[PDB]
Amino acid sequence: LGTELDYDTFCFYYDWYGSEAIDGQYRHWAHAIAPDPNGGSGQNPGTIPGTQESIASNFYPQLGRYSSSDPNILTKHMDMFVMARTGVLALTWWNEQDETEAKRIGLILDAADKKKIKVCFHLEPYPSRNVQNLRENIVKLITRYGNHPAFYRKDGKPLFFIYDSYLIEPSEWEKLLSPGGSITIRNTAYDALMIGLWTSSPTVQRPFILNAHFDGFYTYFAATGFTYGSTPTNWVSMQKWAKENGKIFIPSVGPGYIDTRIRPWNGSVIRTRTDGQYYDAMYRKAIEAGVSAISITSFNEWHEGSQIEPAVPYTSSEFTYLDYENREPDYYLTRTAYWVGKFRESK
Numbered sequence: 001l002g003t004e005l006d007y008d009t010f011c012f013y014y015d016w017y018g019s020e021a022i023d024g025q026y027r028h029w030a031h032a033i034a035p036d037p038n039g040g041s042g043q044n045p046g047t048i049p050g051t052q053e054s055i056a057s058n059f060y061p062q063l064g065r066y067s068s069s070d071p072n073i074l075t076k077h078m079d080m081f082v083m084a085r086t087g088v089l090a091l092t093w094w095n096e097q098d099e100t101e102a103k104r105i106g107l108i109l110d111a112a113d114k115k116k117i118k119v120c121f122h123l124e125p126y127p128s129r130n131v132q133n134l135r136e137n138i139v140k141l142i143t144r145y146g147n148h149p150a151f152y153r154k155d156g157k158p159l160f161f162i163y164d165s166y167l168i169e170p171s172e173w174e175k176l177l178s179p180g181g182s183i184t185i186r187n188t189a190y191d192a193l194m195i196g197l198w199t200s201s202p203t204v205q206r207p208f209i210l211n212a213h214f215d216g217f218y219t220y221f222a223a224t225g226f227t228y229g230s231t232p233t234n235w236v237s238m239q240k241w242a243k244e245n246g247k248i249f250i251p252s253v254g255p256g257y258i259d260t261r262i263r264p265w266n267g268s269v270i271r272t273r274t275d276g277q278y279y280d281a282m283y284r285k286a287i288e289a290g291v292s293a294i295s296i297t298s299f300n301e302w303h304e305g306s307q308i309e310p311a312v313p314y315t316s317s318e319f320t321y322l323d324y325e326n327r328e329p330d331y332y333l334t335r336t337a338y339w340v341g342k343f344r345e346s347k
């Protein structure tokens with residue numbers, strides 16, 4: 001029918017939003033404003049309070065200030081994934097070691113399964129992250145969730161995205177990811193496809209990826225040109241290198257970028273949506289590069305303005321939000337479905 005989910009399409013999902021009613025605070029809708037790293041001492045940037053009028057986004061959710069723990073929101077999000085044809089939800093994972101995290105992960109897996117969506121984890125730069133506690137956490141996640149019907153596998157293997165994987169030296173990664181490594185997961189019950197973050201130039205990244213024994217790489221950033229990896233004119237050559245070296249390249253595409261409510265000094269990174277033309281251009285470059293898998297930044301990173309989740313026009317007494325302009329609130333979901341179809345036609 002040309003409507004089915006694609007299980008080589010990964011959409012980055014954030015479960016960090018809270019409401020007073022469910023979570024005790026409007027978590028993440030309220031957010032600290034970052035000081036300017038070049039703006040000197042004594043800055044008092046303040047906070048966005050997460051009121052109805054003033055939330056930590058330049059856009060405004062159709063679903064309002066929702067809780068990521070609300071089963072009825074999760075249902076709606078899974079229906080949005082179905083509309084977008086995105087078969088894998090790539091869940092932010094911060095190693096919070098708290099019961100409210102555990103509850104949310106279970107709720108997300110359960111809701112996903114009702115719609116045949118799969119879930120993988122996006123391993124974030126949590127405090128003192130290192131290859132030993134990464135192994136322990138991979139073991140825990142596979143043990144806890146590996147028998148859940150929504151747990152993602154590719155040819156029998158789980159898959160993890162590793163954000164800011166450059167914060168760990170290749171000599172450490174080798175211990176976890178080489179078949180001969182001291183604490184290897186290879187050939188164990190806990191083996192997985194490990195997808196590292198390609199940032200800078202090939203001269204740095206090629207030996208990093210090889211020496212670290214990653215199975216593949218992704219680029220994350222929705223803003224074109226932010227890094228070498230997030231410059232789509234490099235994707236043909238990145239894919240050629242991946243194929244030559246038996247690596248999986250999963251370029252990240254997004255619909256735009258703007259984070260100036262939380263980072264007012266970061267205007268140079270703004271990428272305008274132009275009624276969908278930015279998203280179209282980026283998605284076309286990924287498909288044209290001949291890749292096997294694509295990642296989408298993001299479902300709902302509202303702070304960074306990369307979301308495809310529906311947004312509505314809103315002007316409050318405190319802020320005039322951006323909105324999808326000439327496009328309807330669900331445009332980025334249905335445009336994702338269009339591109340998934342083009343990707344499948346190519347695959």
Ligand SMILES: OC[C@H]1O[C@H](O[C@@H]2C=CO[C@H](CO)[C@H]2O)[C@@H](O)[C@@H](O)[C@@H]1O
Pocket residue numbers: 012092122124125163301303304
């Ligand atoms: O956008 C604010 C957000 O920024 C950091 O999180 C990263 C932002 C986007 O994606 C990556 C990969 O998922 C995240 O690690 C972090 O400082 C958050 O605390 C903050 O809310």
